[PDB]
Write a protein that binds this DNA or RNA. Structure first.
Ligand SMILES: [Cl-]
Ligand SMILES: [Cl-]
Ligand SMILES: [Mg+2]
Ligand SMILES: [Mg+2]
Ligand SMILES: [Mg+2]
Ligand SMILES: [Mg+2]
Ligand SMILES: [Mg+2]
Ligand SMILES: [Mg+2]
Ligand SMILES: [Mg+2]
Ligand SMILES: [Mg+2]
Ligand SMILES: [Mg+2]
Ligand code: NA
Ligand code: NA
Ligand code: NA
Ligand code: NA
Ligand code: NA
Ligand code: NA
Lengths: 154, 186, 140, 95, 156
RNA sequence: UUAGGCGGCCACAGCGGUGGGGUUGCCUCCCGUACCCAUCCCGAACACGGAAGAUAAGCCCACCAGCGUUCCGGGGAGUACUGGAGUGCGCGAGCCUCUGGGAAACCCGGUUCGCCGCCACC
RNA sequence: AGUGCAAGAGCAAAAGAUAGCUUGACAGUGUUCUUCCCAACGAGGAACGCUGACGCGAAAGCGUGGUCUAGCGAACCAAUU
RNA sequence: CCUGUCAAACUCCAAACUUACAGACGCCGUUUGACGCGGGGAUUCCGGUGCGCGGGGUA
């Protein structure tokens, strides 16, 4: 399970690439979704590779982001432990997070919006003109690498 | 053989055994084929159908297993051929087969030929086959009369020991008569 | 092994390659059976432009008809060696060719399951000279 | 294209690899298909008759009845529904 | 006319003589020079390596070769060495010599397409590299920058 | 399948070569022209009738890789080329990095001297 | 190689050659594709059927002209069945 | 035998890639009716640029 974050806008990006992001529930810059590691999903993220940031986040980080930017399928409601417990199969955020990470369920299945609308990275990101191996912020990241981005956009 | 571009004929064309152009026209009918084949000493008659991995023979008759019914004469002649045809024709009927088309392989469509005799027999057995009566022998030759008369010009038995000296087209009737009722494997 | 390996005469072709005939008559008597026309291929300067056109005849003799012929033909020829085929044949003379081969030749001349004769079972120039020379005459 | 005949630009698709050259096996020219089956369309360079327009080489249609010995296969050209008259010689069962 | 007009390999390969007529003959006199009777049985083997894909008109090939071999007469008319220009001008070249209407040009020459790193010239010498000099003058008459490379020769 | 007939795939089956096999199930060569039939001339072939002989052909069986073919290992080669991305480089031609794919020739070593179906049959 | 003619393609117990026989280069009426990718548009063309009558073949079958893609023409008026 | 080179109208080979159909996941539709069908009304048929692949041309 990988965390996907659109870092580049729609203007000028191939249409078949944009549709893919839309099929993955991301319709705006900085929006983030969680995606299972499957053949079918793998191909998708590969096609989206140059306009996004992805990687496997740590239990903690997912928990921080879930708490800070998760939302009900509809409404303002804060997704906190209580919400999680009174609305999902799990008893608290950590429980949810773990399930997500082990790809046992999904944000929809638990009545949550498939998208974590993140905040701009505090301190800024490494650039959207180069990949990670080059000092940029595009492409696959380290678990420690994804965590920093996600945490900066917490 | 010579190079990567070389064209090697289909196996059955190499062996000079199957005429594919005739085969295709034959398969057009969508009916079973009445395979009429010969050997120096024998005559075979098969009813073949088309299959996923090759042809399927649903009924056959060999001039050898003719004796199995009382044949005591040579098996590479006209009377032999007809009977083998009738025998396979009957076994065919038993198998639920009602019609077929004559496949004579690489043999020639000569009038009064043994393959046509085979065809005549299969038809009489009850099999429905597209044919032409005046391309067939005149019954007597089918009976084996041409050979009996040939022995009339005796001086020396046409048959080395075998059976009879003046041969028997009658032995033919007795056999056809036999095949037309009861008996095992029919 | 032998008996089925020993040579034999298979057809003797006597043909008169004329260039446009009355010649058949003599071929008929010299051999004993009707001659066959010899059409030609290609249009050429020897006023021989006609494709289908009688330009000679031939006669293929088999069995006795061939021996009874060679029993006078050979005597009218001297030559031998070099003038022999690589398959054990030879032509002398009005032409008279003699095709020689061993017992299982039909395998290559029949319709069903035909097959080319194996080089080993072929007749060599030498094995040929022997057979014929051993029949009323001398080689070279 | 310099011309607009049906065989324009079909040099490749209607030519056999030197080894597949010559009369094709009869087994596939007699194959029987049932209405509803999915069949791949591909002209056999060696088989003259029963062909369809080269543009459809590659299509995968649905057998829906026949005409004579030839089959009637329904395909969809772009967004248009079309029916193609084709013999077994140029058809193959999908899967 | 300037090499500027034909030195790039941006056009499609145009070499089918069955569809092109009136192609000028090549100015290249020989491809095998020196002792062509002998085989490469020499201690040293130096090569002239082109450093960029380019098109080289038979014009330049002949001038470059002459300038090299004509100089290799620092060893003598029948000296002990063999010189080889391995490329041939296959690419036919046109010129549109009406304005841009019906502009497909008419054949005016031929050139050889050499890719960066190929060797256009190869000489064979005994420890007597005057050839190294024959090439400083050779790559002087061809468009690209070049690399003078020595192969069998650890006799430095 | 101690030899057969009809086939499917249509060279992994081709080309070439070695050895073995038949009073019989057999297939052949083979022997022979009164008949059906036949050669623009020949019972060569085709067709018909038949066993004196043979295992020499064919065919069946076992095997050989020199040539051709199929597939595989290792090397060539993650090279050539390439779908996506870049305020990376270069006067430019063009190149480079990240991402997803990925060859051909050739060399060396294996493989391949057919596989499979239906019927018939000491 | 040959297969009438460009080019490309097809074809070997043939689609080529020879021989013999025959007029299916037949009347009628369609299905489909093409012309016009997708995507509407005429004439024309082709593929594949059916009805009828025929040719050849033992027969399956083949023949809706020539192996395939060029060789074509609206309305009005005339002549013709 | 050895040795030096090529192909838009060459091919014993052969990608990336494009593409028909089917299943899966995704997304979408069943009060926002998708897919599709029928009808009304158009505008439009001077285009341009970047990038990739091009063909012509010294450019
Ligand atoms: Cl037979
Ligand atoms: Cl069509
Ligand atoms: Mg909301
Ligand atoms: Mg700030
Ligand atoms: Mg920045
Ligand atoms: Mg092409
Ligand atoms: Mg033996
Ligand atoms: Mg036609
Ligand atoms: Mg008018
Ligand atoms: Mg008129
Ligand atoms: Mg394309
Ligand atoms: Na074929
Ligand atoms: Na002008
Ligand atoms: Na230079
Ligand atoms: Na004549
Ligand atoms: Na034998
Ligand atoms: Na029309």
């Amino acid at each position: 399970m990988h965390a996907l974050v659109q870092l580049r806008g729609e203007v000028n990006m191939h249409t078949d690439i944009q549709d893919t992001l839309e099929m993955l529930n991301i319709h705006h810059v900085n929006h983030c979704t969680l995606v299972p590691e499957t053949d079918a999903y793998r191909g998708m993220v590969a096609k989206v590779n140059d306009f996004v940031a992805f990687g496997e986040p740590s239990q903690e980080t997912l928990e921080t982001v879930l708490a800070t930017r998760a939302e009900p399928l509809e409404g303002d409601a804060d997704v906190d432990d209580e919400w999680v417990a009174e609305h999902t199969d799990y008893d608290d955020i950590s429980g949810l997070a773990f399930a997500l990470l082990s790809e046992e369920t999904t944000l929809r299945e638990q009545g949550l919006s498939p998208t974590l609308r993140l905040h701009p990275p505090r301190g800024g990101h490494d650039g959207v003109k180069h990949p990670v191996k080059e000092g940029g912020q595009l492409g696959k990241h380290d678990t420690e690498g994804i965590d920093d981005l996600l945490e900066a956009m917490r | 053989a010579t190079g990567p571009r070389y064209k090697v004929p289909m196996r059955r064309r190499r062996e000079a055994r199957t005429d594919y152009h005739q085969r295709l026209r034959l398969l057009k009918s969508g009916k079973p084929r009445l395979v009429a084949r010969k050997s120096n000493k024998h005559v075979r008659a098969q009813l073949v159908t088309l299959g996923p991995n090759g042809d399927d023979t649903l009924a056959s008759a060999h001039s050898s297993d003719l004796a199995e019914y009382g044949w005591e004469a040579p098996t590479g002649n006209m009377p032999s051929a007809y009977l083998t045809g009738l025998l396979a024709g009957l076994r065919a009927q038993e198998a639920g087969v009602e019609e077929a088309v004559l496949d004579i392989g690489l043999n020639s469509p000569t009038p009064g030929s043994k393959v046509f005799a085979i065809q005549e027999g299969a038809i009489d057995a009850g099999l429905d086959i597209p044919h032409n009566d005046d391309v067939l022998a005149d019954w007597q030759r089918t009976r084996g009369a041409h050979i009996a008369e040939y022995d009339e010009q005796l001086e020396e038995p046409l048959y080395s020991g075998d059976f009879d000296a003046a041969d028997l087209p009658e032995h033919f009737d007795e056999l056809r008569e036999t095949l037309l009722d009861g008996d095992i494997e029919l | 092994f032998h008996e089925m390996r020993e040579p034999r005469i298979e057809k003797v072709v006597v043909h008169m390659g004329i260039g446009h005939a009355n010649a058949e008559d003599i071929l008929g008597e010299i051999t004993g059976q009707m001659p066959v026309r010899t059409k030609a291929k290609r249009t050429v300067g020897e006023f021989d432009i006609r494709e289908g056109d009688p330009i000679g005849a031939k006669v293929t003799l088999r069995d006795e008809m061939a021996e009874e012929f060679l029993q006078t033909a050979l005597p009218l020829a001297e030559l031998a060696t070099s003038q022999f085929d690589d398959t054990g044949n030879f032509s002398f003379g009005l032409d008279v060719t003699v095709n020689l081969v061993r017992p299982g030749y039909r395998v290559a001349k029949r319709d069903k399951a035909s097959r080319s004769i194996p080089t080993k079972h072929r007749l060599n120039p030498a094995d040929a000279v022997a057979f014929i020379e051993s029949t009323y005459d001398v080689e070279v | 294209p310099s011309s607009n005949g049906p065989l324009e630009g079909t040099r490749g698709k209607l030519k056999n690899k030197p080894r597949d050259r010559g009369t094709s096996p009869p087994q596939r020219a007699v194959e029987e298909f049932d209405d509803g089956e999915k069949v791949h369309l591909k002209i056999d360079p060696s088989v003259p008759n029963g062909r369809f327009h080269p543009r459809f080489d590659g299509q995968t249609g649905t057998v829906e009845g026949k005409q004579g010995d030839a089959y009637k296969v329904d395909i969809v050209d772009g967004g248009k529904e079309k029916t193609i008259i084709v013999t077994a010689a140029h058809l193959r069962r999908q899967e | 006319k300037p090499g500027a007009m034909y030195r790039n390999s941006s056009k499609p390969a145009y070499t089918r003589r069955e569809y092109i007529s009136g192609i000028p003959g090549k100015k290249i006199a020989q491809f095998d020079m020196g002792n062509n009777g002998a085989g490469p049985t020499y201690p040293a083997q130096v090569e002239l390596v082109v450093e960029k894909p380019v098109q080289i008109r038979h014009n330049a090939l002949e001038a470059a070769r002459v300038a090299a071999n004509r100089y290799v007469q620092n060893s003598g008319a029948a000296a002990n060495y063999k010189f080889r220009i391995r490329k041939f001008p296959f690419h036919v070249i046109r010129e549109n010599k009406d304005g841009m209407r019906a502009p497909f040009g008419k054949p005016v020459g031929t050139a050889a397409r050499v890719h960066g790193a190929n060797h256009i010239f190869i000489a064979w010498v005994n420890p007597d590299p005057n050839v190294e000099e024959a090439w400083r003058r050779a790559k002087m008459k061809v468009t690209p920058t070049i690399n003078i490379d020595s192969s069998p020769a650890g006799n430095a």
